[PDB]
């Protein structure tokens, strides 16, 4: 559980997200709920004019001789931040974990420059990621991401990081009316087939095995060449400025804590599976689901790690009236369920017979 190594424990309560963030001077600020703290700066920022010209592409380097650095200390992160400050464009991607965490957390950050690749250990330097704010806030540095919707949110949630002059290569492909996955872009422009196998891997594991180091590196390694090729296609249709505009709108999106609606969320997750239930089974479905979300917040686990969705329906349908019967419905039994089996049993007991 990486959370136990966190310098700051995660607040999972149903309270709007309040961002704590650092500026380019490394000064700490406390933001406001529902307010993106860099909204005024992003809306007042121009695209660097050199980025809007037709330029020859810089091809990706060889994976055999391209320098790759694994960054997992503060000093190595700071050294990396100064290297990035001498670039006009960098390619960024993130790896994330959502099963054994309520809100989820970023596990790894990958960065490529025209001359080298970097892999940042977000877990080991979680508390120090704010040091990247001069790079992410620098308007003269374009930050290239491929399909950044979740990334934009993750950077906020975990590190108080915000992107000034984001360029999203997936938005470029959508605007050119063409396929837009990362694997597609790399195969279309570079004729390289990306390894599918590690998209759903456990990015919390340390050490990272060689195959996963290679997977992480290859997600950014070809992105600046892809960026150059999409720029030429957009100027060949101002479609290039439109894509920078759409990407800026995406950078204005805000992270918001998972939203539990005690009157609605259960229906959204159980959908059609609520048909065939009596009024008391429906009451049990709702209360088990609302309990599952509360217990998920407390354990800092996703609701699925507390109890599978079918287990919620199983309790509702079967109406277990003993701890063992409740344990049968909940298989595979989590610690959260085993420790609170009497509470789940009380939920069922308060609903059987006449209401």
Author numbering: 179 to 415, 423 to 540
Quote the study that presented this structure, word for word.
The exosome is a 3′–5′ exoribonuclease complex that plays a central role in numerous pathways related to RNA processing and degradation, both in the nucleus and in the cytoplasm. The eleventh exosome subunit, RRP6, is a member of the DEDD superfamily (DEDD-Y subgroup) of divalent metal dependent exonucleases. Rrp6 is composed of an N-terminal PMCN2NT domain which was shown to interact with a cofactor Rrp47, the EXO domain containing the catalytic active site, an HRDC (helicase and RNAseD C-terminal) domain, and a C-terminal region responsible for the interaction with the exosome. The EXO domain consists of a classical α/β fold composed by a six-stranded β-sheet flanked by α-helices and the HRDC domain is constituted of six α-helices.
The electron density map revealed the presence of a disulfide bond between the residues C496 and C515, linking α-helix 3 and the end of α-helix 4 of the HRDC domain. In order to study the effect of the disulfide bond disruption on the protein structure and activity, site directed mutations were introduced in the cysteine residues generating the variants TbRRP6CAT-C496S and TbRRP6CAT-C595S. Crystallization trials were performed and crystals suitable for X-ray diffraction experiments were obtained for the mutant TbRRP6CAT-C496S. A complete data set was collected and the TbRRP6CAT-C496S structure was refined at 2.15 Å resolution to final Rfactor/Rfree of 17%/22%. Similarly to TbRRP6CAT the residues 416 to 423 could not be modeled. Superposition of TbRRP6CAT and the mutant TbRRP6CAT-C496S structures resulted in an RMSD of 0.51 Å for 352 C-alpha atoms aligned. The structural changes resulted from the disulfide bond disruption are restricted to one of the helices involved in the SS bond. In the oxidized protein, the short turn that follows helix 4 moves away from helix 3 for the SS bond formation. On the other hand, the mutants C496S and C595S showed activity comparable with the native protein, indicating that the disruption of the SS bond in the HRDC domain does not affect TbRRP6 degradation of non-structured substrates in vitro. The mutants TbRRP6CAT-C496S and TbRRP6CAT-C595S, lacking the SS bond, were also assayed against double-stranded RNA and showed activity comparable with the constructs with native cysteine residues.
